[PDB]
Structure 1
Amino acid sequence: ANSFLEEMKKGHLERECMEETCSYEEAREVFEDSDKTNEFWNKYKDGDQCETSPCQNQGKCKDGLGEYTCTCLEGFEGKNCELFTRKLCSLDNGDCDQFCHEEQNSVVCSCARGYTLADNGKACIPTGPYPCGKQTNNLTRIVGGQECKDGECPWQALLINEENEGFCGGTILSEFYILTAAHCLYQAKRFKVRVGDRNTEQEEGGEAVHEVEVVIKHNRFTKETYDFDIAVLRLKTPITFRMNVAPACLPERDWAESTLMTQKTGIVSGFGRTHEKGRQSTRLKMLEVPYVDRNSCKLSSSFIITQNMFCAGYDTKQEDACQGDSGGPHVTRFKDTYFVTGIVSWGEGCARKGKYGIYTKVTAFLKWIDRSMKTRG
């Protein structure tokens, strides 16, 4: 193997690395190539390991000094391409877009209204030009907020009384139905809904104002605890979708609990006050807040919280919902779509440490909303 001349003459594989130990390099010298240096020198004593092709189902092999790597194609894996992918929504969302479900070791992907199943079995294809959930130093009372851009926040609407003063927000769900808060109905006897609003003191021509015709409120509403704070408004005139006016999709309760509840952060948009006991915001404002665990939600709340309410906001940062955002939707940005998961309900103070805004849970009222949209439709 080694000598005064064994490693001084010409480097040939038909000489050094063959009849002794072939420790190292003498398999690399002959070729000058560190690529198969340690993918072949393991095959000097005990024989080859990939020649059997342990990987089946058209899977390639890779040799290591003790264990074998089996590269199996998309949807195929295994120690020797032996195990199979357990189709469940736990990892990779089951390839679904909006609704993922697992049953009988199979994945059912279902899309909401306005989308159709694609023949590729991995996508939901929109059926409209403007489908739901699609977008087409800051001092002086700016608590971490940012201004909504053109088409960035099209699902927000403002409720204005006879004095044209915004007091509550609303969610655009269809051409005739608007989702808002139940207590706002007690603020004004008659009010109108303005969609596409960007500034209360400036009209850019993209704002559509419609009168409210039908009002539906929850029968079990309680004033003391603000429970069941949800309202549905059917407008007299239809809402025409455009660049700054788009609807929002309605997710499923089970699927929202499956993955939407574990989301790190969500977005709440509205025209609420910048801070507690302050002036109303002139322009639409959006804020990103994280979810709060139910244990701390119950421990930090002085009132009774049922299954229809959840805490959100920052424990330390001064970023939380305030007055004027009632009826505003909470939107989570899934792979390509914003899904409504919460409705602004109330909050113990604004920008206060140790307090989290309480938001109504949409998933607990999906059946009620569906019944309301069809009872008088």
Structure 2
Amino acid sequence: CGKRVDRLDQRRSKLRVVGGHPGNSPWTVSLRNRQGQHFCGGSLVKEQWILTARQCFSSCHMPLTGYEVWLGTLFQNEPSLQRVPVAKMVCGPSGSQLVLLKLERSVTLNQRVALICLPPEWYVVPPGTKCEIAGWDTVLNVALLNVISNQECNIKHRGRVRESEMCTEGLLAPVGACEGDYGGPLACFTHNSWVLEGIIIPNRVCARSRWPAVFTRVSVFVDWIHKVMRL
């Protein structure tokens, strides 16, 4: 899992931190609505499974048949691509804001399609650690983020960051994971490997200079996640 040499920058684009920029994120995906347009983004957790956020969807039981995933690309409008439909959905437990997704057929990996390492159960991310966040102009835009404690961010978030969450410190640039970018992953590099520690969820105020950003904590619900696939 969770290894790119690919984007020659993995530990070299920690220079262009102050700002949001274009770049590569292979594990990030793009959930495609019944009509055709992109509506939310995902995270390749296995060849069959796409972990993403509950808010992307209205109801956990709406017919999916038609809803599709688009792994392979950068752009959101060329056979450097894949197009796998969604067969079903599995609504994570009350408060996870999580949604796994079985695909009509297991995907094939390469340079710009790759799995990401799920973390240990309940493993907490140290402040200071470096994580990244892709998003959608017409192209992907990775951006590198500093991790901060639930102590630190509950100050600015006015004591409202529950135990099953995390925050990154605010980019000084007016840029951050907001509308249509939810469900996209929040990969963190540890022991020489990128590891899915969060999921872009709605924030109160988003892409706001010097303001934190909250994500739902994945390690907090992985025992659920494995159980969902294993069987």
Alignment TM-score > 0.5, same fold: yes
Structure 2 partner of 1:193: 69
Q: Structure 1 residues 200 and 317, CA, compared in 2 at 3 Å: closer, same or farther?
A: closer
> Could you give the per-residue CA deviations for residues 201-227 of structure 1, whole angstroms, max 9, x where no partner exists?
2xx31211111112000242xxxxxx3
Q: Of residues 143, 165, 181 in structure 2, which corresponds to 1:287?
A: 143
TM-score (norm 1): 0.53
Instruction: Identify the structure with bigger relative contact order (alpha carbons < 8 Å, sequence gap 6+).
Output: 2
The gaps in structure 2 that reach 5 residues or longer are 7-17
Query: Percent same amino acid at aligned positions?
Result: 24
Q: Contact 2:20/2:173 (CA < 8 Å) preserved in 1? A: no
| Number of the residue aligned with 2:110 | 242
Tell me the equivalent position of 1:67: none
Asked if residue 333 in structure 1 is aligned to residue 203 in structure 2, the reply is no
Contact 1:348–1:355 at 8 Å: present in 2 too? Answer: no
**Is 2:92–2:100's contact at 8 Å kept on the other side of the alignment?**
no
Q: What CA deviation, in whole Å up to 9, does each residue of 1:256-296 have, x standing for no partner? A: 43xx424433101122xxxxxxxxx4111111121223223
Q: 1:351, CA displacement in angstroms? A: 2.9
Query: Following TM superposition, by how much is the alpha carbon of 1:316 offset from its aligned partner in structure 2, in angstroms?
Result: 4.2
- Root mean square deviation, CA, Å: 2.3
Q: Distance in 1 between matches of 2:206 and 2:55?
A: 19
Q: Residue deviations 1:286-335, cap 9 Å, x none?
A: 11121223223223225733211122131644343211211111111234
Contact kept in structure 2, 1:300 and 1:354, CA below 8 Å: no
Structure index of larger Rg = 1
Match of 1:216?
90
* Cα distance, 1:182–1:244 mapped onto 2, change above 3 Å: same
Unaligned 5+ segments in structure 1 are 1-130, 137-142, 221-226, 272-280
Match of 1:252 in 2: 120
Separation of aligned partners in 1, 2:177 and 2:169: 8
Asked if 1 retains the 8 angstrom alpha-carbon contact of 2:30 and 2:38, the reply is yes
- Corresponding residue of 1:165: 37
Residue 181 of structure 1, aligned match among 27, 40, 53: 53
In the alignment, the residues of structure 2 paired with residue 214 and residue 355 of structure 1 have an alpha-carbon distance, to the nearest angstrom, of 36
Structure 2 counterparts to residues 291-330 of structure 1, below 5 A: 291-301=147-157, 304-314=160-170, 316-330=172-186
Secondary structure of 1:359's partner? strand
